[PDB]
Write a protein that binds this ligand. Structure first.
Ligand SMILES: CS(=O)(=O)Nc1cc(NS(C)(=O)=O)cc(-c2cc(-c3ccccc3)cc(=O)n2O)c1
Ligand SMILES: CS(=O)(=O)Nc1cc(NS(C)(=O)=O)cc(-c2cc(-c3ccccc3)cc(=O)n2O)c1
Ligand SMILES: [Zn+2]
Ligand SMILES: [Zn+2]
Lengths: 175, 175
């Protein structure tokens, strides 16, 4: 069975003062091809590339994507890193160099064995108009808004096959 | 081997106005034992349980954790879900009923084959003092701040073994 509301609450503690000012900053996903992923997250989902970091010795790049106004990106290099890495709710895309040329390589989306991570989710004003546009742009759907039991909730996928929930918090079905 | 800054920006499109109110709302992780996870995220990391959702027919519960003040959680039941699911940067923890009692069962953290998801990251005022507390609390580390390729950043793990990065944005430029 599931936990009762009371049982859940008994497992929770109040925020220790040392965790003052902690924020949830990033979620990292590995991406096979950064060209494809950048196009998807910026053109399809409307996110902005706020920081790109390269590490030539270690042969990887990090791309930080966020719902931020491109005009708020600082001009100076050091000021830019501090700003981008202090934004709430960023997506960190990791490019291990060479993966895009390896035909036998792909990443795993966590939705088949072995499972773990499931999805990121984007809150939108209207699930139907958002998905209508996704269809016109040829986006791959795991679940269209009105497919199955739960109406008004969708799952799409990115170029690596990671699932992205599309939800309207104002129009969630009753529990 | 990686993209140039210019090549990267050439794959970026400006955010479509139809996307202007979109926000990155949630990252979903499956959890074996919700009691242990709730303890970790609230007591260790200082998050707040902002919404619990139970689905008795589908035999799962969702736990939404965020860095929010519990006083901002609305009184009205329908107003609550709309508030909780419109917060940026939440963690959705999924309990599939029965996993806590099954010895053969565990989730996969994405950092060994097959890889995909990597981590969530928490921005903190002071990586070293946060980690000193984590050690005191018996937290399992993947990377202590002064270990590994880069100093000043840490990785810890949650009860399921999911990796959590601990970073101070204001010192990232100088690592
Ligand atoms: C719409 S569905 O039932 O066919 N699929 C679905 C699946 C999952 N996760 S799971 C059990 O790992 O597969 C969560 C949800 C889900 C429900 C809800 C939700 C919350 C409150 C009311 C109604 C739905 C929020 C949310 O973020 N997610 O991901 C939906
Ligand atoms: C510090 S370490 O090299 O020993 N570990 C480490 C590992 C990874 N991921 S990866 C390529 O999958 O192994 C990212 C980072 C990392 C660096 C940075 C970063 C950004 C700007 C300046 C310095 C570090 C940000 C970030 O979010 N992450 O995750 C650090
Ligand atoms: Zn990271
Ligand atoms: Zn979800």
């Amino acid at each position: 069975g599931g936990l009762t509301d009371e049982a859940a609450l008994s497992c929770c503690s109040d925020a220790d003062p040392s965790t003052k000012d902690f924020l949830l900053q990033q979620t990292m996903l590995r991406v096979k091809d950064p060209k494809k992923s950048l196009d998807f997250y910026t053109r399809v989902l409307g996110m902005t590339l706020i920081q790109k970091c390269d590490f030539p010795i270690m042969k990887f790049s990090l791309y930080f994507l966020a719902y931020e106004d491109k005009n708020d990106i600082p001009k100076e290099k050091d000021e830019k890193i501090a700003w981008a890495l202090s934004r709430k709710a960023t997506l960190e895309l990791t490019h291990n160099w060479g993966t895009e040329d390896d035909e036998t390589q792909s990443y795993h989306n966590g939705n088949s064995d072995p499972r773990g991570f499931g999805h990121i989710g984007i809150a939108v004003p209207d699930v139907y108009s958002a998905c209508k546009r996704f269809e016109e742009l040829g986006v791959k759907f795991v679940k269209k808004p009105d497919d199955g039991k739960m109406k008004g909730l969708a799952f799409i996928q990115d170029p690596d096959g990671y699932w992205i929930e599309i939800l309207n918090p104002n129009k969630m079905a009753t529990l």
